[PDB]
Design a protein around this ligand. Sequence first.
Ligand code: BEF
Lengths: 195, 195, 150, 50, 50, 200, 49, 101
Amino acid sequence: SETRTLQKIREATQELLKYGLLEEASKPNLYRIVLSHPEEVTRILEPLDLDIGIDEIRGLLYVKVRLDETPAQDEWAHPLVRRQRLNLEQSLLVAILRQHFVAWEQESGTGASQAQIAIDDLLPQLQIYLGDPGSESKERTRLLTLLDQLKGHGLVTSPDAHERIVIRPIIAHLADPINLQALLAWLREQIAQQT
Amino acid sequence: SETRTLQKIREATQELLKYGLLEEASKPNLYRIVLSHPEEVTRILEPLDLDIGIDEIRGLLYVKVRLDETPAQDEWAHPLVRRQRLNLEQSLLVAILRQHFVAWEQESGTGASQAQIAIDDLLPQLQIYLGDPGSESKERTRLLTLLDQLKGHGLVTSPDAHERIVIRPIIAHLADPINLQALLAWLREQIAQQT
Amino acid sequence: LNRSSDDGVTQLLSHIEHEVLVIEERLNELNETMFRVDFQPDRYLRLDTKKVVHESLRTLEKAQRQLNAARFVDDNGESHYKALQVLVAQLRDACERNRTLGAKALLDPRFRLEFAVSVMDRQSGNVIESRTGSQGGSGGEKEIIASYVL
Amino acid sequence: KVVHESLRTLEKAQRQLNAARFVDDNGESHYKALQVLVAQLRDACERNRT
Amino acid sequence: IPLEEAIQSLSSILIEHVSQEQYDINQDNPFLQASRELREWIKRRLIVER
Amino acid sequence: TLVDALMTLLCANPRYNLASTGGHESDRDLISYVRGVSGPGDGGEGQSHIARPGKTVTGIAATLEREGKQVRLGALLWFDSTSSSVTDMKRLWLFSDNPGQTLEHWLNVYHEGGTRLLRQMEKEAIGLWTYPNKKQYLARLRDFFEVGENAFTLLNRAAGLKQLNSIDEIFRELVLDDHSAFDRAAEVANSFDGLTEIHQ
Amino acid sequence: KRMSEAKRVDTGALVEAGADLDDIPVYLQRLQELTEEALPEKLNRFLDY
Amino acid sequence: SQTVLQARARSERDVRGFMKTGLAAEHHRVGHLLNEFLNLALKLDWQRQMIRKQEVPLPAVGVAVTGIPAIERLRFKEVDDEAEQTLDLSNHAADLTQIGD
Ligand code: BEF
């Protein structure tokens, strides 16, 4: 009877709200459609105070709070977007992944296909800040659960059949990347001072 | 160029989406706003395949999945439904609660808001079906776990100081004749299979 | 279709790469001219450059690689022609929308690399500051960035 | 002194409402005129940075 | 017997029988084993806690 | 930097480094002044450009004197971790008219104890006020200096702003106090909600 | 079919009613109620306001 | 004796409270279907966890949408430092004027 939003756009919007992002790498049909109808998606999200920011270089779309332009409130608060503070280990892992991603981009260029990194490569680096919990069976399990937790936020893919992961584009758009650098360097200096 | 939905409507619809339902007993200032502009709220929720459900007789509002121009599928298969499908043992308690609700509503009238029940009144009810573990603590824990799982669905509040709960009016819409008939049809087929 | 070939696109991409390399080579002379001067008491300015691989170019490369594979699956060549059509669509679309930066980062050499100024240490040769613009700075410290890079 | 188009339109709506009170129907005209006026104020509040 | 009091007495009694390997009595923790024993009794319907 | 030290105390949302930009943009933030960020950094893993990376404290005060009476504004800002985000900075805005109160004394008290010690000191000492958030402190400043809230914004944007590109814009946004009747319009529009509900 | 649409448009007064031939009296009584009492009272209140 | 009598009184009060319910709802429409369903439930084997963890075909009402995963919402761990304090507030008398010609 009455007009209904195009099925593909509805699917794209629901997906974008569910997962928080789209990528041309793994969802081309929806990603291209969204870019071909930006005014429709932005109109659909505006009533909820949500709005898509698009990163054409890396082929990514991600939701972000559309609240007022620097109102009397110096920090935004949104009913639906529940804020989180990653625990210490998650913060360290995110910092390591972020610096790996930036270092790779420095060479291959912005938006270059990320090189697959093996699980074995990260444990020595987490050891630099967490020591040895007691066994390989423990540290590897911890690293795997941490990677699975991060995949929920969309920062990393699942370990493939050969135990290598790929860093997702969304890592570049974290809220305050300066925090990762500061904490990581501070803990590194702590261990270097205690040793 | 830029056209924004009224700030009151945005706040009310965001709260409605957050909690899944909205009542005049607890949040009158938002319930009146939503009920005064149902067309705007319906068109805001249409892109997400969600629709409003109004009950002025009980001062209730709740969002429900849509099927128009996307028939069949499954209501719980919708991407944005964040909670698991209803479970049989939960449905038994839902039926008991609905029975108490119809009794109370038919004796008080629909206007009153205190559709309460005492916790001790449900334990004998469940003893007939789920069996008797011979330990008041175990069965009380079972009953409270079920009530919590229902609170996740929004059909009941948590026990108060006097070990009394309030059956939210949404139950009247969850178990109404159209759905009870389908549940009975499914259950008869299950029993026939058991034979 | 047998007589057809994919040389058309690969030559174009090679030409664009050659143009980008020419631009970088030309900047390499300006860097050496910069080296002879002092931007600060013992710092000398340098112009750096990263490469930008827009999603458009990655998609084009993916389509080309799929075209290479589709030639060896026989359905009266239908799949090969479909792949060729999908590939040609990207070129044509970029051609019509040449004013959007998306096609610029594919066909325009100037948009294939991003620029940023860097202050080098005269003694050690390390980087002290990476400066994609002139934000921050005092003024005078901002004006010197502006005048040097201009 | 400068009077922007918005105030002129609101004045026009004021006069229109004033005239529409007398039409003999069950509010389908008076109420419409009242709401087309109140909509101007609602819009003004909503986009108070325009 | 109040349940918490029962656990104490049952654990103290169980501590005496640790030498009877004929029934595989272990030594890790008497309190937790007493709690498990009371649960086993309750479900087997020898005792009912109310 | 010295000028912005004062502008932070005086204004509500100061425009740092306004003069260098010419008047149409500010390109620094209070976080970067507290940390003493010396630039964009080397663009990589380095952290030599930041001066106070760990736990740190910062203080600023200004003394105004008329006929011997001293009124000493002040502010304390500190971090408890490497975090350099606005939510993790903890503040305390101080207003005073006691000659004995000075920045050194406040810093000594802080080094002796956190916010609680200063809150107790507020009770202990006469002629002192503290406010955990800036709005109340600025309200105190207004009711002391008998000016509208726009006066100090005018002062801050007059620190630079050499252009005066559109007199209308200046006088509408920076001089004449806000007296818009938006609240009244919202109240009037709400008067008809009773009608709208019944019609619905 | 049409009772199922009356259910869709309804606003809580027909929650205790199915869409089978058994429930037709409920719908008819609701229609009579609207025609007789509720609608004129609501219109009088609205026209007063 | 007192314990047994109290138990009897509690049970009798509980059953009397139950009997009134159902009496006031036997011929209400939804009450009729609820009684029908509750009768059917007895046949099922509630001891089997698999049986009492089936999924019924009840609709989805009150569907809450929340926790949209906006990447901005993440904040990183605030590891605290407690080693020492920066007490130094010397006058900085090294400020004596020595500036280029
Ligand atoms: F006042 Be600064 F030198 F721009």
